[PDB]
Amino acid sequence: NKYKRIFLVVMDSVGIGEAPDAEQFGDLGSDTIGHIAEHMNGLQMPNMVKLGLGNIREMKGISKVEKPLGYYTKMQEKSTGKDTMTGHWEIMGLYIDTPFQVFPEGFPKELLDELEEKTGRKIIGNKPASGTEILDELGQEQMETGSLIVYTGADSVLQIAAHEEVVPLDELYKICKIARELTLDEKYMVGRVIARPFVGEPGNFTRTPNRHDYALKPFGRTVMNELKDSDYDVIAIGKISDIYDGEGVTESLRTKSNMDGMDKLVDTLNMDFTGLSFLNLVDFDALFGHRRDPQGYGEALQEYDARLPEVFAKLKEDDLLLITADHGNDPIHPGTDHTREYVPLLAYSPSMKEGGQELPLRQTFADIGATVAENFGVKMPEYGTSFLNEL
């Protein structure tokens, strides 16, 4: 192998400006990093700048450098959707024609009617909410009736809440598996069905760690599957395992924050493995993008950037670091959905003695998967063009 280890970091939702097809999605004008940089009066990301972030595009506080540490470009999404699953599945070598749906006004009556009819249970609520706002509103009615609280969120999710002493935990799981089957339907296709058991009494409800997420498997065998099948390590960090429903994963390390994610990345740098370490930094998306909070988003990007020098210090000559994103989520954009944007790509190894250069723009996120596959000599994905030889 050219590289013994590849460290792939997805800065979830960290877009670098509207894609050519942005108008289809109502995303004209979107620019995640650029709008954050303006809000911050100049982003302080000296380490990403050293890698070549500003060579991809100049933004407030983010300038080009004469000699970027590694190679740089941006990537265009080919798949139909702009959701997390679509982006990640594309990154690992697929093409996804059918988009996952988000439901800001709640779910169609048709879906919920079928769920009632298959379960013999009433459904109440139907609408976006936090799992503490909706329990305050409807938790008592749930206890007294045995009905199911259905709700959504800013992401492609269907969430089902029931009190554990009224609807047995095992029943709630069965109901969620039924819903997972009903939602394999392009009209209603949610990324995740989520069991949200709760306990307590009116005015004091709390969700339990008995939460269960029901994900769809990727629509194809990914580069991860191929690495696992050839006895390589595939270490998933953060939401990565859930995003791929475990497919091709050999070890999974849960994280609770972006900083915890960077700690786990450092943990893998200390591991003797051969294969792929794959991190998702989700806070950008979950805490800041969807909540339209550019200040919090800017601060998180600066916290992330400050962690990078330790990573640079630990990378070996036969290590490759890849930094990218899975879509945009512009915190100054209307509504609460993702934004259809290019994503940055930075590729760095300490073995790059003369530093990096610009890569041709990547026409699909699958160029990452193709590059990983070629590095490790496993079956090449159906989609994507490797840039391994360019590095």
User: For residue 337, which amino acid is it?
Assistant: D
Q: How far is the CB of 285 from Mn ion (least distance, A)?
A: 4
CA nearest 234: which of 281, 274, 280? Answer: 274
Q: Can you list the pairs that 308-316 forms with residues at least 24 positions away whose Cβ atoms lie under 8 Å?
A: 308/47, 308/48, 309/47, 310/266, 311/7, 311/262, 311/265, 311/266, 311/269, 312/47, 312/69, 312/348, 312/350, 314/266, 314/269, 314/270, 315/7, 315/269, 315/348, 315/349, 315/350, 316/4, 316/5, 316/350
Contact 328, 15 (CB under 8 A): yes
Q: 285 a known binding residue? A: yes
Among 390, 362, 368, smallest CA distance to 380 is for 368
Amino acid identity for residue 165 in this structure: E
Q: Going along 219-373, which residue ranges are E strands? A: 233-237, 251-253, 275-281, 319-324, 343-348
Is 326 known as a binding-site position?
yes
Task: Confirm whether residue 333 is marked as ligand binding.
Answer: no
Nearest CB to Mn ion, comparing residues 26 and 220: 26
Q: What is the contact surface with Mn ion in residues (CB under 5 A)?
A: 12, 26-27, 84, 155, 285, 326
Q: Which residue, 283 or 367, is less far from Mn ion as judged by CB? A: 283
The beta strand positions in the chain, using DSSP E, are 5-11, 71-75, 123-128, 148-152, 157-163, 192-199, 206-207, 212-215, 233-237, 251-253, 275-281, 319-324, 343-348
Q: Which is nearer to Mn ion, 96 or 162 (CB)?
A: 96
Which CB, 277 or 324, lies closer to Mn ion? 324
CA 181 to CA 179: how far, in whole Å?
A: 5
CB of 389 to Mn ion, least distance (A): 29
Closest CB to Mn ion belongs to which residue? 84
Closer residue to Mn ion in complex, CB, 68/81 = 81
Q: Which is nearer to Mn ion, 147 or 364 (CB)?
A: 364
β strands within 62-191, DSSP E: 71-75, 123-128, 148-152, 157-163
Reported residue count of the chain is 391
Residue 162 C-beta: closest distance to Mn ion, Å: 25
- Measured from the CB atom, the residue of 87 and 197 that comes closer to Mn ion is 87
Whether 327 has a binding-site annotation, put simply, is yes
Annotated binding site: 12, 285, 290, 326-327, 338
Annotated binding site for Mn(2+): 12, 285, 290, 326-327, 338
